[PDB]
């Protein structure tokens, strides 16, 4: 149908990088998702999760290493996976409501025995607001960021980020200077040779808001690490270990060099930047780049080999906090926020339930 070709051009939108960043792909996968909601005839509530789980497997298998689209489809399933059990026990008579949100998850698989009366249409419209409330959360994640980080950071300390390609801290350190009138500086390195496009863009707009800033090269960041005692890292996605999928380049080893000086390592992440999946292989999520902008000569006869990398991964031992919209959290606590948003079935998002 007409919705079946808009997903195909959205499949075409996720092949050749027609959108980038952890922000804009999540809004555009979700506005496109509402077209599938408004033109679906499920006829059973377990068919509608079947209508969407294949669609994610038409998306995640189509492109794995994008995740702001990949975690919405599980979460918007989870708001309906909640309400299957809502209309289940309210249909029954004896034990209609206990309403405690947590049952012991170890024992639940280990005990197996074997007004809105029905209102079958409501799963559509509660996902129609489920379209809307997700985006309106995403529009102002920074208020929950800024409520806790000026609490967490203080006035007179030099700083450092390895991620200039983070529009969060690009917007956050404006009001971290503006409302809270704390004066400090930020060291800034380049994501050579990829975020150095934006690294020169980053401190220039901070030079407009004049936070004593100066650009360091990538090689020098150890030699000034003894002075700085606080680093913030604007990540791209985050998994269940507390090992996060960061931005493009250079940020993992300096996160390691920060950890060796017993320096606290900060990170910011929206709640929609969470992901209920596990990093089985680090190298199946570390995406590389091109031999073009790392040497442009292109010798065919000498013809050496060279390696680019446009994804860095850090262990959770090298990270300390998660400045989120709902508070700061341990690197090991990440499951409990995630399993309050995701379920154990659609994390193996695949038609073969082997």
């Amino acid at each position: 149908s007409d919705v079946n070709v808009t997903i195909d051009t959205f499949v075409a939108k996720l092949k050749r990088r027609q959108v980038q960043g952890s922000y804009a792909i999540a809004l555009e996968t979700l506005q496109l998702l509402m077209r599938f909601i408004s033109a679906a005839r499920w006829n059973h509530v377990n068919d509608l999760i079947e209508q969407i789980r294949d669609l994610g497997n038409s998306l995640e298998k189509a492109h794995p290493t994008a995740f702001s689209c990949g975690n919405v489809i599980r979460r918007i399933l989870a708001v309906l996976r909640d309400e299957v059990e809502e209309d289940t026990m309210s249909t029954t008579v004896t034990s209609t409501s206990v309403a405690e949100p947590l049952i012991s998850s170890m024992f639940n698989l280990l005990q197996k025995p074997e007004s809105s009366m029905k209102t079958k249409t409501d799963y559509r419209q509660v996902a129609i607001q489920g379209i809307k409330d997700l985006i309106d959360e995403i529009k102002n994640i920074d208020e929950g960021i800024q409520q806790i980080a000026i609490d967490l950071i203080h006035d007179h300390e030099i700083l450092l980020t390895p991620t200039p390609d983070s529009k969060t801290v690009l917007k956050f350190l404006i009001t971290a200077r503006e409302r809270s009138n704390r004066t400090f500086t930020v060291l800034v390195t380049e994501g050579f040779p990829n975020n150095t496009k934006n690294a020169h863009e980053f401190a220039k707009k901070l030079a407009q808001h004049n936070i004593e800033t100066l650009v360091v090269p990538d090689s020098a960041v150890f030699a000034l690490m003894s002075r700085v005692g606080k680093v913030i890292i604007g990540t791209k996605a985050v998994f269940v270990n507390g090992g996060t999928i960061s931005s493009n380049s250079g940020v993992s080893s300096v996160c390691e060099c920060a950890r060796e000086f017993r320096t606290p390592v900060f990170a910011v992440a929206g709640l929609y930047k969470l992901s209920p999946l596990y990093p089985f292989d680090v190298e199946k999520f570390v995406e590389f780049g091109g031999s073009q902008r790392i040497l442009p000569r292109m010798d065919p006869r000498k013809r050496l080999d060279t390696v680019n990398q446009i994804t860095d991964y850090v262990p959770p031992e090298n990270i300390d906090i998660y400045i989120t919209n709902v508070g700061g959290f341990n690197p090991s606590f990440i499951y409990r926020i995630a399993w309050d948003n995701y379920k154990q079935i659609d994390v193996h998002l695949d038609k073969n339930k082997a």
Partner: protein, 342 residues
């Protein structure tokens, strides 16, 4: 000036109020007089003493003519809290009780003839500290005792708050052999109150000072137990100053460290830096003709006196509450299951 922690404005030294719009309770001035001139509390001693004056001050209702008792006491009691804020900013042992009390102000209706206003509040706020404190401390006793063998040592820091009663139980109420190491610090010698008490109880007490801390650890030593002031949402122990130096050292010297604490001493807030959120207390105290005078008026001199400081949760091995024991990374899961829920 480079750190500018002297210009961290967590407290000032403002005093000398005169206002008489509110009918100020005279005895709640005595509580603030007993704190700020010379500190006589831990944290749950405050949570007793803050409750000691509250039962008295509600008994003098003095409800005006055109005002419901739900409408005045939310202003009347809360105006008296600002007297304490001039003396000493609150704890979570302060904080979790008073917001629970403000629930009880709100859940009453215009039906009470003010004779019934005592016993619906009095026993209820008595059954608060009967349950949340007293028999909460009873479950501390059996849990820690089975984790302590005979003929061992305990290293405490400062005045304890609940494990004084634990050390009384294992030395007298169970009579198993035990040696006690109490260390405190200049300026607040509150650990000497324990040093008086446990030898009045008749047990082997070795007093110590934090400058001589290594030679305690160079002997037969284990089971470092700690008092507490609040636990962060990460697992950081916000407690009395100088706690972490033994907490790093005993963890470095591979003998385990526990924190005796309770669910009332949890908190929703979170940080990871020692000098961010703290309190200073009257820098004249670290002087005692003296040796120096004039931190004021002299160029380039200042006296700091840190009260509270964070300990990394990796130093803490096991966190014991009234519900049981738990590893320190697993602190905030009770915040969704018991605190405001139990």
């Amino acid at each position: 000036l480079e750190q500018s922690f002297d210009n961290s404005s967590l407290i000032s030294s403002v005093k000398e109020l005169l206002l008489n719009k509110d009918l100020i309770h005279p005895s709640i001035l005595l509580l603030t007089s007993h704190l700020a001139h010379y500190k006589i509390v831990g944290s749950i001693p405050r949570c007793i003493a803050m409750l000691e004056v509250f039962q008295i001050v509600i008994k003098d209702y003095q409800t005006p003519k055109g005002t419901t008792l739900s409408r005045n006491l939310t202003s009347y009691l809360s105006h008296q809290i600002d007297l304490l804020k001039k003396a000493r900013p609150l704890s979570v042992t302060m904080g979790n009780a008073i917001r629970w009390l403000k629930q009880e102000i709100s859940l009453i209706d215009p039906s009470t003839p003010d004779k019934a206003a005592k016993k619906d509040l009095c026993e209820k706020i008595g059954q608060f500290a009967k349950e949340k404190i007293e028999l909460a401390d009873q479950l501390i006793i059996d849990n820690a005792s089975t984790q302590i063998e005979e003929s061992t040592t305990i290293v405490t820091y400062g005045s304890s708050k609940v494990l004084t009663e634990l050390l009384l139980h294992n030395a007298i109420s169970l009579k198993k052999n035990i040696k006690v190491i109490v260390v405190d610090s200049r300026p607040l010698f509150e650990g000497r109150k324990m040093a008086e008490t446990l030898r009045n109880a008749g047990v082997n007490v070795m007093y110590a000072l934090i400058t001589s801390l290594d030679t305690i650890f160079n002997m037969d030593v284990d089971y470092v137990f700690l008092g507490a002031h609040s636990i962060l949402s990460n697992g950081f122990l916000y407690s009395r100053a100088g706690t972490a130096m033994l907490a790093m050292s005993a963890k470095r010297r591979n003998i385990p460290v526990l924190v005796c604490c309770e669910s009332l001493k949890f908190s929703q807030r979170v940080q990871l830096d020692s000098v961010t959120f703290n309190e200073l207390a009257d820098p004249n105290d670290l002087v005692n003709k003296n040796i120096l005078d004039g931190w004021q008026e002299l160029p380039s001199l200042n006296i700091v006196n840190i009260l509270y400081d964070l300990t990394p949760p990796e130093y803490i091995k096991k966190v014991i509450t009234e519900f049981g024991a738990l590893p320190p990374s697993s602190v905030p899961v009770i915040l969704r299951e018991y605190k405001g829920s139990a």
